[PDB]
Amino acid sequence: VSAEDKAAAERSKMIDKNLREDGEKARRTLRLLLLGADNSGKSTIVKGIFETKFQVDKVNFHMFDVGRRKWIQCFNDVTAIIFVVDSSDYNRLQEALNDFKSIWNNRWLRTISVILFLNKQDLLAEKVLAGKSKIEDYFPEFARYTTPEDATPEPGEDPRVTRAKYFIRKEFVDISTASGDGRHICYPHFTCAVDTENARRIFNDCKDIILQMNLREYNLV
Amino acid sequence: VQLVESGGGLVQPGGSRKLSCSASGFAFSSFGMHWVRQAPEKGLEWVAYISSGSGTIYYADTVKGRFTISRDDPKNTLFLQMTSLRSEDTAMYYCVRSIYYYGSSPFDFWGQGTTLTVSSDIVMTQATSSVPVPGESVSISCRSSKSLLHSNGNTYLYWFLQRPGQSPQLLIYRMSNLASGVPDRFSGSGSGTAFTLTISRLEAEDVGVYYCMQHLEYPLTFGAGTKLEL
Amino acid sequence: VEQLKMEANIDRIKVSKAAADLMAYCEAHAKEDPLLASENPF
Amino acid sequence: SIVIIIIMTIGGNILVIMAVSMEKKLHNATNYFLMSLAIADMLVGLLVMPLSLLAILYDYVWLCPVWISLDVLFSTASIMHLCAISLDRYVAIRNPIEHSRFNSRTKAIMKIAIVWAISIGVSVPIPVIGLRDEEKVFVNTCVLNDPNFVLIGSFVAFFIPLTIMVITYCLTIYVLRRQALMMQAINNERKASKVLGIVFFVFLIMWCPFFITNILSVLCECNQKLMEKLLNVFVWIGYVCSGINPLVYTLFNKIYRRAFSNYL
Amino acid sequence: DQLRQEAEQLKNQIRDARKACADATLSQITNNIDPVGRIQMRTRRTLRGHLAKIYAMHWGTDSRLLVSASQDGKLIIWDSYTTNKVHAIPLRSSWVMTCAYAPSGNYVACGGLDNICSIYNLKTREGNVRVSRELAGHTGYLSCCRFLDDNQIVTSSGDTTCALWDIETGQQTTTFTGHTGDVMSLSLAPDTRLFVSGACDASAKLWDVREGMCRQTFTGHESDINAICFFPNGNAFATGSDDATCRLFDLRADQELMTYSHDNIICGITSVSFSKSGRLLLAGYDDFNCNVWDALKADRAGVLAGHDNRVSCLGVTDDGMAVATGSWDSFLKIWN
Lengths: 221, 230, 42, 264, 336
Ligand SMILES: CC(C)CCC[C@@H](C)[C@H]1CC[C@H]2[C@@H]3CC=C4C[C@@H](O)CC[C@]4(C)[C@H]3CC[C@]12C
Ligand SMILES: CN(C)CCc1c[nH]c2cccc(O)c12
Prior knowledge:
The complex is a heteropentamer of chains A (221), B (230), C (42), D (264) and E (336).
Chain B: E1 2-6, E2 9-11, E3 16-24, E4 32-39, E5 43-50, E6 57-59, E7 67-72, E8 77-83, E9 91-98, E10 109-110, E11 114-118, E12 124-125, E13 130-132, E14 138-144, E15 157-162, E16 169-173, E17 177-178, E18 186-191, E19 194-199, E20 208-214, E21 221-222, E22 226-229
Parallel strand pairs in B: 2-11, 13-22
Antiparallel strand pairs in B: 1-3, 3-8, 4-5, 4-9, 5-6, 7-8, 9-10, 9-11, 12-14, 14-19, 15-16, 15-20, 16-17, 18-19, 20-21, 20-22
Chain D: H1 4-21, H2 28-47, H3 49-58, H4 64-94, H5 96-102, H6 105-121, H7 125-130, H8 134-137, H9 147-179, H10 184-219, H11 224-240, H12 245-248, H13 254-263
Helix pairs in contact in D: 1-2, 2-4, 2-6, 4-5, 4-6, 4-9, 9-10, 10-11
Chain E: H1 3-19, H2 26-29, E1 43-47, E2 54-59, E3 65-70, E4 74-79, E5 85-90, E6 96-101, E7 107-112, E8 117-121, E9 130-135, E10 142-147, E11 152-157, E12 162-166, E13 171-176, E14 183-188, E15 194-199, E16 203-208, E17 214-219, E18 225-230, E19 236-241, E20 246-250, E21 255-260, E22 269-274, E23 280-285, E24 290-294, E25 300-304, E26 311-316, E27 323-327, E28 332-335
Antiparallel strand pairs in E: 1-28, 2-3, 3-4, 4-5, 6-7, 7-8, 8-9, 10-11, 11-12, 12-13, 14-15, 15-16, 16-17, 18-19, 19-20, 20-21, 22-23, 23-24, 24-25, 26-27, 27-28
Residues 84, 87-88, 91, 95, 98-99, 102, 107, 110-111, 114 of chain D line the site of cholesterol (CLR).
């Protein structure tokens, strides 16, 4: 071959080397997708496309906030999805349940786990203690609900907020258990506007997900 | 885009000297570099070549074992180490920039040059000493000892123009490709071992010496040169 | 309403004529289609 | 009669080898090692089992100086494969993120190279000594008599991997027990312990008796006739656990079960 | 209250006008045309280097240079004959969804979820590829871009609008409105006078570039339209949708001509392209393969099954001697 073709081959080899070098750094960052409706408090869970970065225990995370039928297709390689729901507005809980159902059963997200945050617990507790609004006005089935004997309420909590919180958590979880066949798991959590431990929960859940994938890879499950 | 060479001076036989070139205005690390030497009554001669990534290095058959070429990407500088200089080394040295990929122009830019004073190959043949001659047509021809047409469809012939007091400038590469910045008055054609250069209309700036070069195999060879006198 | 009215004023032809034109175009350039060893660059 | 186990071993090794190429969609770093293990087991079945049956049929000799070396080499390779799988399982379980970052074909190639390099070390001197000393390989009749190899290579072949595997199993069980204290996330972490226990105990049961008998036949001399009678039947158990390892490591993922059901 | 009745009456008038011209079908006139037979194609080149799913691909005018875009954030220019790489272009954002190659070979364009169309200069004296201009003004994501010349570009976005741009000044000169859903794919006529846009409202529209007015609207699909191709003669459409159906439209009969479907296909369609003569229709599927269709018979001539994941890219060279495909397995293949 001519000398110019050899020089072009050398240039191509250098380009391949530079492409290979860049790929190593990309694989060391975990990517997360953040979804939720307005008034849910998405921007405070860890405090065209908005981005944020944080690091816990020498592990880097990258979270994306877009702004759903079309652009969701390009987020099928993320480690986990974060979903935030306001638990102190009974008028709009059915919309949240419908959105969670529409996200859980999406054909492009069949292998991605969901981390569920139930936010604004203090307002829910205040409303339940005040007694100016009742869950039974919107959820008739709540009048027949009883707190399970295996509940572990926080010490000092009145036994009237635990019932409401567990009812909401059950209503959200029951959608997750109806389908999936073990391919992905939901991780409910209770948080508030002032909690700071939220960073550790994401790290623990991601480590658990990677452990599950490794267990499946070695023909153990 | 600017290349400035330094060094030079008067040396005694058996001595040594080191030349340097400073590059600016372009991505130096992506270009290959050549050194070209021109004698007062001999024409252009190829000396050495270094790849962009310092992978491959070539030397002329008259400079092996005495000349050393090096590259410094972080400082955008070149170096040429010369030892055991002879009387035949007194000549002008030029620095040339080269890049190789599909559709590129490997001999687009030339430096200014510095002066140094002491005390199988393909033959390219031109035969005319002076062509006397504004507004007229002029044809200059070149002839090679071996065919320059490769099996891939490319033919490696280059044309250069050297005005008085100026560095060589690229006109045509691969026998039909007009270089950027050149007016459309220049054209070229040929086949096999015979090539011609055509100028449609001469001006006051078309006076100089025209050179032919082949790029099939190393070492690179140049023609004798054809002088156009208006 | 205006868009529908503007679209209504179209001079239409038979489907058979357009299909015959499509067939004629397909037949006319049949010899120039290399997809339908010394010449293959790959 | 006993020849059936050879056919089953060959069939299982062929099924394991085929279930990786044609099926595809299988990570190289963890599924290419099983192909090497299957190839080693098939070579065991092809070069070792048919020749011992000839000795059983004849009760005499005819071979020995190269058959012994091949048997030792391939058995050591299989044991090293099992130990490497155990170590890799422990590493992948305790440090998921670092293991996920590390996974590449340069680990599978390195592991295969290391196990096959170690496997051949113990079999080189077997023909070297045998061809220069008939008594070392023929006694009274094909059996390795020299203690200088029996009491030396046996530890490297069996006894160190056993300690590595038991320590790995204990650490992995402890780690899996500790993690579950933090639901499908909890249920899946017990089946792994069940499978690990099954595999470890199968390996221990199938391989333990032969080396104990072989050490006692040398360092405790004890009736040699009874010892050789026990060796004549214990060595075949080690051969049997060459078509079982390709299975117990495979037919727990639904993908492998479906591939085996459709192919066979 | 009164305008709805007028709109319904006009729609009924248009429907009655369209039905009057259905005097024949393709399935009847083509009974005298021999089938193309069985077509076999094999892989000739394999392009490696991408580390993520490939989303866009486009051929040059010389039939040798090729540009591809992927989620790794880099843009690669390929030499198809030798597999050597020519350029590697980093992107400011990794969520790229489309790419294009200028007909003169001097510029390349790209875009995605950042709502900005960026144009790159491939021929500079410094030797580096540099950004020439960023085109802003859309509110949704950018799905496709196509060059008209060195100074005009047409873009489609998810905000139901289309635009025609002036590269020299960076200002929008014409806005195309009338869609009710996100706009997915564009196709430019050979005469550079009309372009076609598909959208998620299961409709297709024909636009006039010089005036900015919609001329015709086509319906028939039951779901979102993902890809649109243009017949070489300028008088036909080729469209695909998520209902596993391909359709042929005519701009003079103003109605559908032929439907391409099969009972064994239950997946979506990602790309549609034509051959030089228009006899073959190529389509990408989510079944991890590509099918070859007979445009005049709605039959199946062959299949390409060398990919291990979804096929997202499909293109044919100007000389018709090669077909290129792209998939989410980070590999490109050249078929002949
Ligand atoms: C894997 C093949 C070659 C068999 C070799 C034995 C196995 C069990 C052992 C030997 C050394 C081990 C490696 C040692 C170091 C690391 C770095 C760590 O951050 C990820 C796991 C990784 C990459 C280990 C994986 C398993 C490993 C390869
Ligand atoms: C029976 N066979 C399956 C293998 C025996 C063997 C492997 N390695 C050894 C090392 C020393 C002494 C031995 O008998 C061995």
